[PDB]
Amino acid sequence: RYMSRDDFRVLTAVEMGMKNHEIVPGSLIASIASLKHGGCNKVLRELVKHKLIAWERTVQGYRLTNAGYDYLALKTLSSRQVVESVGNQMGVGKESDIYIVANEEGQQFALKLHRLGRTNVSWLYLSRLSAMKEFAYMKALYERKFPVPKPIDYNRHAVVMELINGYPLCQIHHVEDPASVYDEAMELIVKLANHGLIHGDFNEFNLILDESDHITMIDFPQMVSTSHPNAEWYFDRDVKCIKDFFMKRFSYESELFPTFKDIRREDTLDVEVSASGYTKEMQADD
Q1: Which of the two ends of the chain, N or C, has the fewest CB atoms closer than 10 A to its terminal CB?
Q2: Residue 112 annotated as binding?
């Protein structure tokens, strides 16, 4: 509802202070925040009420909530006119919640809200890094003509991207022909591998099928380098997950499946160098 910059500053102070300490005490928040009419203990009470923050007891203070972190990122993105309205949750990634958003112009985009960490300090830190990783790797992959959505903008744990019109393969019971859709997923495995990457979670919950039955990689949070001592294990596991899915969903069994010896390297690394490059540029601001 009605926010005010004084209320947004205290939220950013709870956030700032959360880098160190599980719980940021009032006195340390008043210092980081600053004001006029100085009514900080008043603003903290107004923030507790709107459940953007929470109070806890060791001694004794404030933590930003999931709703608070969500608001900080969504309001920052709004200032840039990347998000004007948030919809219902329509998806999930391995460590994220997918939502449909809209800009000022009424154009619809997807939004990923990353949620990782089982400790306050490692929660806002790892969720931010997980968002930094997705934007960096989508930028790097999209530049190399990989079937991934277009990266739009990032902030904190929030990643705005091209909305892909279509459904995940787990929702598709009938395909025109499983022979082409099966081969395209296997080609994406070999393609990633040729660029020095192994997905790690190649499945029917991360692959989206569009109008003319094309595949789009939506979530790739824990990639493995083909240089890994156990890379061939990770490669094959991803292959077998596709064979397991097609055999049960459409009963499409085939012998046109790849092996780790079929991989022919090119630029590899480059993709990591490009993705690391984007992560450094993003890390330069906080």
Answers
A1: N
A2: yes
Structure tokens at 31: 């210092």
81-106 burial, b if ≥16 CB within 10 A, otherwise e? ebbeebeeeebebbbbbbbbbbbeee
For residue 52, give the nearest of 36, 31, 34, 75 by alpha carbon.
Answer: 75
This structure's resolution (Å) is 2.6
Query: Is 201 marked active-site?
Result: yes
Q: Which of 7, 153, 201, 236 is catalytic?
A: 201
Amino acid identity for residue 59 in this structure:
V
- Domain containing 188: what range? 167-276
CATH number at residue 256: 1.10.510.10
Q: Are 42 and 5 in contact (CB under 8 A)?
A: no
Q: How far is CA 140 from the centre of its chain?
A: 15
Supply φ then ψ for residue 15, to 5 degrees: -60, -55
